[PDB]
Amino acid sequence: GRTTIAIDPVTRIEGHLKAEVVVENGKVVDARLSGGMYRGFETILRGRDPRDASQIVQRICGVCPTAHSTASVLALDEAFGAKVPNNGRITRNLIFGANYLQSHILHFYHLSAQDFVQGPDTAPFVPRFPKSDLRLSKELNKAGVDQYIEALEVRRICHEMVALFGGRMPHVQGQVVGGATEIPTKEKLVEYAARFKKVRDFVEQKYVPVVYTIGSKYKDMFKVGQGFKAALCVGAFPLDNSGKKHLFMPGVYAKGKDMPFDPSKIKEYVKYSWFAEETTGLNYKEGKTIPAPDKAGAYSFVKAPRYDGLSLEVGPLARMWVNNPELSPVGKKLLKDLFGISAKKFRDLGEEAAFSLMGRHVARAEETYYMLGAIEGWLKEIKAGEDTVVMPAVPASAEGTGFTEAPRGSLLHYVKVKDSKIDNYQIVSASLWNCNPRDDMGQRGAVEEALIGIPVDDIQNPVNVARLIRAFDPXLGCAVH
Amino acid sequence: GERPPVFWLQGQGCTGCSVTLLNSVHPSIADVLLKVISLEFHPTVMAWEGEHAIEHMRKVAEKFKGKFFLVIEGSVPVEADGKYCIIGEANHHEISMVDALKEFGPNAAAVLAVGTCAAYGGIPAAEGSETGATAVSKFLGDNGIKTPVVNIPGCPPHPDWIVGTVVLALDAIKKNGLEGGLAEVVKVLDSDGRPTPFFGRNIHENCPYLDKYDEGVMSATFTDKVGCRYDLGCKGPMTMADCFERKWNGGVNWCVQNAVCIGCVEPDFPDGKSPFYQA
């Protein structure tokens, strides 16, 4: 028989989300995700000095504000014709890269780990489900708790790294159209490197190993949550000034095939979203945001983006699958020792295990290790004292698009300027790609589809529903804006 | 002594107030959670979820009626019968931010409106918005709720302003009891409801570049750190905060050193502080 389970709020994510699932014979057979809070940044932005956008857009999301900063300044750079000095490009990478480290560590320990680890006997770690399916030994659970506590310090240090050249965090002051506002000094680069060493040691010695080790006690979690097995990456982190090369290269993967990314193929649908029907199916260059909170049939403030008709996911798994880097040495070792798996590159996990509840946690840990090498490279490349900004005039009429990868997945901002003010501003964010509702054809969003098949052997303790959701690291502020 | 129960409800916020709090140095967030407060409901970090989390809050609220601290982050949108912010569901009934504040507001010892959105409306209430985003104090007043409100603004606030205001309250309550203590807190609020220990001093009059301002020596590019930032848009003259001294993120930088102040703690943020990059 059927049982319908509603969870609102889904906790240990960012923002406001309701999940409703239908369970039959011990498994999820249908799902609906509802983003329940709207602000309307795309309309708030209209009429402003375009340079204000790179501050205003950060308040979409205080967990990933550097991603919005980056997409906004890239869009403004294009619109204004600003030529960011090479040293400013690298400085921006140091600011934004440091928040990838913060965000992944925050996500695994402070958002996700309580799915597998019992915290101390005080709020906010209790009360919780009577049968929470917490499988770790006394020793391994204690390591989880000890690392959660250590990670509070490590993620704070990552924000110090962000602030060194970014001013403060949340909400950097240091990225603007034309580059970065503060030239790195020798002294502050020493400070960044010292903090980075501490973060590196934590990532290498604690975080990557604990994800594989906990994963090895939850091997069943690699066999569910596949969904569409379809992914998007739009590219991120310019490694030179020519723009021909990025740390993450763009690509689409669906139905077992790699394909190029063509942004003209993005459309946003709204049949099941609380927006005016006449705005359905628009590419972001012609995007419109007209709220309709009373529209019959709709169940979310998240629009439904589709790529050439496809429902895709984004995030570390998407990027790691598309780019297929070598696995970390410790990952290779623990895959063999704890799982009996021989792997060299990320795709060697196989499609099924990669696109899974636990595979998404593994991808995020591997990507964190990957980012260490990128930041190390930027610290070698940066030049103390070299100018990081130009000061371009505001255009009367212009347009620009900025594409990057936020920690949770693909992000683009589009801006059109008319009479020297913002005429239109459109945002297509990572958790929009993951946590969206059905499109006009009835095709589910990525997380909705990934919920299908999730086991619920105990309807009174349906812990795997939110476990699956948390693997995607949702932030509904980003999704709805 | 016993740590006071705290519920953290987010309306139209970005979670920046939670993230900023995680960056607290002294005390650390671990010490705040384990030694200073009992954070009984906070959807971003708590173990439980959904209706169970809501019911846990309601049970604690009943046991500590009149005694719990309610942290409200984000503005409260009143348009469309509250539908622009749904924070939970229990008994097959959705719970809007409007609903939640009407339920818990009257029974809190005090409401701490954290962040400029909650304090003053902020970006969700700015020009071009259409959700009826409302500041906490206005919403409570419009609904006859007399619970004391303390504003701790900023976009985001510094962690020290949030933790420090909690400690201000705890010290006062230890000395005077709950009602007498909160009265002593209200006595150190400015006309915008902000505690004077953190918001009683002006950025500009305390700024290390004030001499350059007086001399008319203005930077023409952000990266010129010698001149005053006024022509680049600095709103320090109109801003009451102690950022010049405590700085940000473990003291490693602050907005005027790095770029410009955007006046994020002020009731007219953002519109009255915009455009950000011209005077």
Ligand code: SF4
């Ligand atoms: S205008 Fe006042 S003196 Fe120049 S607070 Fe800003 S940089 Fe300092």
Ligand code: SF4
């Ligand atoms: S008050 Fe930054 S913009 Fe807000 S943190 Fe301006 S110096 Fe204090």
Ligand code: FCO
């Ligand atoms: N990371 C992040 Fe925020 C989301 N989802 C963006 O883009």
Ligand SMILES: [Cl-]
């Ligand atoms: Cl980010």
Ligand SMILES: [Fe+2]
């Ligand atoms: Fe959008």
Ligand code: NI
């Ligand atoms: Ni986000």
